[PDB]
Design a protein around this ligand. Sequence first.
Ligand code: VO4
Length: 574
Amino acid sequence: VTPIPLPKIDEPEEYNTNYILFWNHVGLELNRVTHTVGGPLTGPPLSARALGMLHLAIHDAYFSICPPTDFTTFLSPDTENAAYRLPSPNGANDARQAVAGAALKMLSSLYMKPVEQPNPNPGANISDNAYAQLGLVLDRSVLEAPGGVDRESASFMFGEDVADVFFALLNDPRGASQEGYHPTPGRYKFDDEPTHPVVLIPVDPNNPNGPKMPFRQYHAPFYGKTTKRFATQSEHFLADPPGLRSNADETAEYDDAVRVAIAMGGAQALNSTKRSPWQTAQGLYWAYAGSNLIGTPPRFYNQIVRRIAVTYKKEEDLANSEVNNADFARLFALVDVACTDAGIFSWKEKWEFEFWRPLSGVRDDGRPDHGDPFWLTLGAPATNTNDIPFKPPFPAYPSGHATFGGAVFQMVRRYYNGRVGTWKDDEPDNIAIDMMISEELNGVNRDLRQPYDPTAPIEDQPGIVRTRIVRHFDSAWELMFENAISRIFLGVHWRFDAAAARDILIPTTTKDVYAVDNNGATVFQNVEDIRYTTRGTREDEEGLFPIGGVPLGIEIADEIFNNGLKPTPPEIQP
Ligand code: VO4
């Protein structure tokens, strides 16, 4: 099997001298490779789950051997419930090997061929080449691991056992099943994307050039309501989106949202598009649309967190510093677990409301003076490919990116408060980062003129190269904000999918109608002045709930952090 030539990562090579970071890196490599070959754990929610599982196993393997003082392990060795009982070291005192065994076992269980029955139905769609490519990554990581991997050591074996417990407990084999689901057409209702209503998939994944069959995909419609949560201590809910249920009367907000959607998220050459070149860059920067050699958003968030971690480490030595090892092991567990749970609840709410995407909303609006039956969005970039590929669609409210970002960055804020600076938990921080490059705009990746060739490095394939943009951010508050609004710039999310329009836009004299500049472009509030305070109602529940993905993510992160990273009580699991 010819190894897929992977493009160089924009990050100091010193990072991987630290074994916690190295293993995180391997998880990210598998993330981008699986999205290049169509292997297991694709898509936003499941790819996040994989990283959450990986870091939970690493967390407990390390902290069992080098026990912490201000917190404990996720699972305990004295648990009565066998499923939640952590293995005991019993002599194993090599943390490096414990982490290695944990990481290797977990990733192998996650990405290697589920020969044990699961191959049928569940895995019945993944080619042997996909597994082969993923195996190569795993195989060389063992040889690339700093300090080597001693598979014979007791510590390595302990790590393996830790992984087994977590895999058995949290793996969700049928997480992406769509069996039984079908859209329910109507105003505000999610249905097949008008630009990609059907896909022609090969009857045999091992013969991609053989007979195809028409298929209609929906991304994980039952996952959110059935899957096991990681560390959340309760169920989270969002207000009804404008136009539905208790907020069906919020028509002014909806109408203005349609207006903003057209102006800010339309295709580049449309006369109605008012989005600026810089805003277009902001939209693509956070994309990570599950593309070839790129992967999904959870990968980018980890790339960013890696930089933050190293920039604010307590000790200079990246290779042999237990202070750094513990710090990184704890940070990533917190972040990736928050990311996992964020994916669960955003998906749960997405399929609960089944709110339609701006593309369908604008086209099917029906009012001659409001809609545009021929509107086109800038859309999620089809990076490293020569066309606009069909990707399993999912409802709009709330934004997955917004929820992931809210959770990941609020967690980082809670973790570094009082260490990098001091701030109120709900106000802007000072966790700044420099030289942050997105693979969507790195001067290497591109929009190909012909089909992607996995036997040749991206640089040798003709196409339009993405402009290299090196960014600097002043705070995790900014990262959180921009990550959310980037979806408005692409035209894939409504303004309320991110947060309440009242909390992010500049108001006018007319309620629910917001300010636009000279050229008609929407004006946003300054990041420093943004507070996610506006809540709304739910038809099915009493009280005020958060609006949009960002607020939802913040809440999930605060809850997990406040409880010190504790398992979801089994009694409240679905
Ligand atoms: O991943 V969205 O749900 O922000 O398109």
